[PDB]
From a paper:
The 2.35 Å resolution crystal structure of the R301A mutant with NAD+ bound shows that removal of the guanidine group renders the active site solvent exposed, suggesting the possibility of chemical rescue of activity. Crystals were obtained that contained NAD+ and that diffracted to 2.35 Å and 2.65 Å for the R301A and R301K mutants, respectively. Comparison of the 17X-PTDH and R301A X-ray structures, both with NAD+ bound, shows that the mutant has a solvent exposed phosphite binding site that is covered by the side chain of Arg301 in the wild type structure. The multifaceted but incompletely understood role of Arg301 combined with the solvent-exposed active site in the R301A mutant prompted attempts of chemical rescue experiments to better define the function or Arg301. The poor activity of the R301A mutant could indeed be markedly improved by addition of exogenous guanidine, methylguanidine, acetamidine, aminoguanidine, ethylguanidine, or N-guanylurea. We show that the catalytic activity of this mutant is restored to near wild-type levels by the addition of exogenous guanidinium analogues; Brønsted analysis of the rates of chemical rescue suggests that protonation of the rescue reagent is complete in the transition state of the rate-limiting step. In addition, sulfite inhibition studies showed a large increase in the dissociation constant for binding with the R301A mutant, and sulfite binding could not be substantially improved by addition of rescue agent. Collectively, these findings along with the X-ray structures illustrate that proper positioning of the side chain of Arg301 is very important for efficient capturing of phosphite, which cannot be recapitulated by the rescue agents for the R301A variant.
Numbering used by the authors:
A (entry chain B): 4 to 327
B (entry chain A): 2 to 329
Write the structure that this text describes.
Amino acid sequence: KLVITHRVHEEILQLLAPHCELITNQTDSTLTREEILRRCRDAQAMMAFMPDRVDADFLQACPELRVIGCALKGFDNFDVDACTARGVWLTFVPDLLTVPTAELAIGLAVGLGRHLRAADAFVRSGKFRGWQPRFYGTGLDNATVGFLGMGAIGLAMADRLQGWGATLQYHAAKALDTQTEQRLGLRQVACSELFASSDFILLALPLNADTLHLVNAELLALVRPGALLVNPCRGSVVDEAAVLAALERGQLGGYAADVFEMEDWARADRPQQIDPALLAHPNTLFTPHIGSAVRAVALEIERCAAQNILQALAGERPINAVNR
Amino acid sequence: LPKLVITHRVHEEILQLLAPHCELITNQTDSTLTREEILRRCRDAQAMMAFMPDRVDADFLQACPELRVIGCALKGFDNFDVDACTARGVWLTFVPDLLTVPTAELAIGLAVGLGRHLRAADAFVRSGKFRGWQPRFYGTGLDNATVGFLGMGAIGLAMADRLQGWGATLQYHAAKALDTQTEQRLGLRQVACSELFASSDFILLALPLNADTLHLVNAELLALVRPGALLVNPCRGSVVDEAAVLAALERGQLGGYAADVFEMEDWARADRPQQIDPALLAHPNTLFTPHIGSAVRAVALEIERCAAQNILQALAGERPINAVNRLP
Ligand SMILES: NC(=O)c1ccc[n+]([C@@H]2O[C@H](COP(=O)([O-])OP(=O)(O)OC[C@H]3O[C@@H](n4cnc5c(N)ncnc54)[C@H](O)[C@@H]3O)[C@@H](O)[C@H]2O)c1
Ligand SMILES: NC(=O)c1ccc[n+]([C@@H]2O[C@H](COP(=O)([O-])OP(=O)(O)OC[C@H]3O[C@@H](n4cnc5c(N)ncnc54)[C@H](O)[C@@H]3O)[C@@H](O)[C@H]2O)c1
């Protein structure tokens, strides 16, 4: 018995069908936590998506569970240790999400830098009347781009920015080997230096206890006036309220984000919404967690999660297991 | 001192560079100068510094017999009758490189923004109705896509430079082939025009407006595109037939149109439309910018400088470094 909480490609149902009894959700809807939990009561397997939160109380109510196959990279809403305590494999997708998310993050950098939203609303209002000196903005040429985090998305973005004439630097918990540093023209800097010397700041790190509200009032206070911040990872890696305050005083030049604190279900004090004053600020650009919203990629993400689930159900160690 | 007419506001530093050599008739106030007013200022001028709003035809030159050089603060001189300039011994100069990169940057941004439904995505978040991830808002990435470039000069190349590592298959069609070193370097393959339009997931324009390129992207070429193909125009409005573009959008064949430029601003075109069609402005599968390709302020100051230096070379009797025409 396998529960799939959200819609997947028919080809994926067909790969699963001969090994598993499928309890599926082929709608564009997200079901309530209580319905998902009802479906998983006697389930051996769960295919889990971004809206899902799995904790000890969840696992306790589902004693037959052998594997959670997550169709995602950041498992921050899944209690890994609780999974391991109850003999449950926790599985993720380590690479397939990286490229479309990195593409979006560059696009958001450029869009934020060039006042794309405002520019577009201006043409659409039928007020455009040929060239004027207006909407002057920030490009990547001769700029300094700093990466917080240098794993999959950091590296993919660094690859993609090779021809953009920018100076690249990064801060991470784990250093790149210096060979890769030379080849990508990356300089490793301290976090303070990162925030003080970067015209663009691209966040590329997971959400965990140590990264929660890491990007706070203190780090923001170090930024060059007009610096641009882009968040393609997890909302709670920044203090959205400190981001707002930084924008209102004019020090932060722009915040663009694909992700929001309000999505981070594992948090007891999770905000119920994005602050209306952040939505209203002109120096912003937002997308609704579409980092990997390419259909062709979704198929492969679904397939990878499916493969992991079938491996676990066959007694094997899943290739992308997150626990041991 | 030779008299120099500047049609638009310029940075103070540029006044200081020019005032020692020329009498300046400036427009630092940016007040709307009518053709008739510009002619009045230029009637006994030895030089004009021209910008994107300027249009110079044979009748204009005729009325300005002292002119020796028109210094253009721009790349695309489609609005300046070069041949008429040459025949009257007036240098015409432009700015070959300073506009390239920021325009290339904008256009990749527009490609990604168009591909990923940025406008609608942002509206949804800003609406207050975001509830977290959903299996919707699906888009088109660059990885595994075929990107076709029409034109392969300064901007075409800056764009190709910027797409290295993006996992895309790169192809192009131009009036002149790229050298093989550069095709090898950038992974670019040369193909016919029609082939480019039939096999590209992204089509990125990178060509000037002239009599051969006018309305080149017409109903005929658009009828070849893969359904869902995305078209990006950072060049001139009129290399495209916006009406044929709109119909291709409404039909559902063309997946999207993004533009930094519009037919309505191509002033030398007697028959240009008076506006961008409201139905195109209202179409969901679009993304627009108001001719801000070069709008990075570090860059505008240098654009003005370049045009100013060229004027000065011309006035000193030199052949100006960035002359477009060639004089006997
Ligand atoms: N918006 C989306 O659609 C989307 C898609 C995929 C991933 N993500 C999120 O992005 C995060 C990162 O993605 P990835 O694939 O690059 O992950 P990754 O694990 O490959 O890279 C993480 C990087 O962050 C660094 N890091 C960890 N703790 C840090 C700290 N305290 N300070 C500074 N750096 C630290 C690591 O050293 C590593 O360099 C994921 O955890 C996920 O939550 C979002
Ligand atoms: N949006 C902006 O702010 C902005 C900024 C700079 C330039 N531009 C416009 O972009 C245009 C292109 O700029 P560039 O710097 O790349 O010019 P360029 O002269 O360096 O390159 C033009 C390219 O177009 C090709 N071409 C010419 N006629 C063609 C045809 N009939 N079919 C196919 N290809 C043809 C040429 O072979 C050349 O490769 C300029 O003429 C200008 O109008 C716009």
